[PDB]
Amino acid sequence: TAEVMSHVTAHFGKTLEECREESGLSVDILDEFKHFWSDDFDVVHRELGCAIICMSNKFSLMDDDVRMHHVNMDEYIKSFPNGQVLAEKMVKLIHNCEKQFDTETDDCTRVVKVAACFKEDSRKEGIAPEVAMVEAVIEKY
Ligand SMILES: C/C=C\C=C\CCCCCCCCCO
Ligand SMILES: [Mg+2]
Ligand SMILES: [Mg+2]
Ligand SMILES: [Mg+2]
Ligand SMILES: [Mg+2]
Ligand SMILES: [Mg+2]
Ligand SMILES: [Mg+2]
User: What Gene3D superfamilies does the record point to?
Assistant: First the structure.
């Protein structure tokens, strides 16, 4: 659900600044990770794919094939309030989007394509939060 997605986003996004330099993710491409969810942000930059790999690896959320680690991602989502309601559905959505991009050879580009698909399908499923709701939880943890 959208409030659970806001907690996951607010926490995951605390690794954006330490991953900017190695990814080339300029503040002029993305200032605050919460903006990922804005109607007005296109999820397309290779640099953002590279940043998400860096961010994921901080929490062991990707496996050695540079794809989501299903058990670690389930356990991470479940670590937030009401997380069990989102954990299976979010793992499913991400993995269905990874299957659509399996022929992309460039890991950074693949990840950003997976991320855009995940945004699209989260919006369609009614679990995409507003930027305001991520902001409301930024102080936690
Ligand atoms: C994790 C909370 C918000 C994340 C937004 C970026 C979406 C990244 C999902 C893809 C995860 C890595 C899988 C790509 O193979
Ligand atoms: Mg840190
Ligand atoms: Mg680099
Ligand atoms: Mg800022
Ligand atoms: Mg690792
Ligand atoms: Mg684990
Ligand atoms: Mg390439």
Answer: Pheromone/general odorant binding protein domain (1.10.238.20)
Method: X-ray
Instruction: Judge contact between 91 and 121, C-beta under 8 A.
Output: no
**How many angstroms separate the Cα of 98 from the Cα of each of 19, 74, 77, 109, 139?**
22, 16, 18, 12, 31
What is the separation of C-alpha 86 from the centre of its chain, rounded to a whole number of angstroms? 14
Indicate the resolution in Å.
Answer: 1.4
Q: Are 81 and 49 in contact (CB under 8 A)?
A: no
Ligand 1 neighbour 16 (Cβ under 6 A): no
- The CATH number of whichever domain residue 140 belongs to comes to 1.10.238.20
Name which residue sits closest to atom 13 of ligand 1, judged by CA: 68
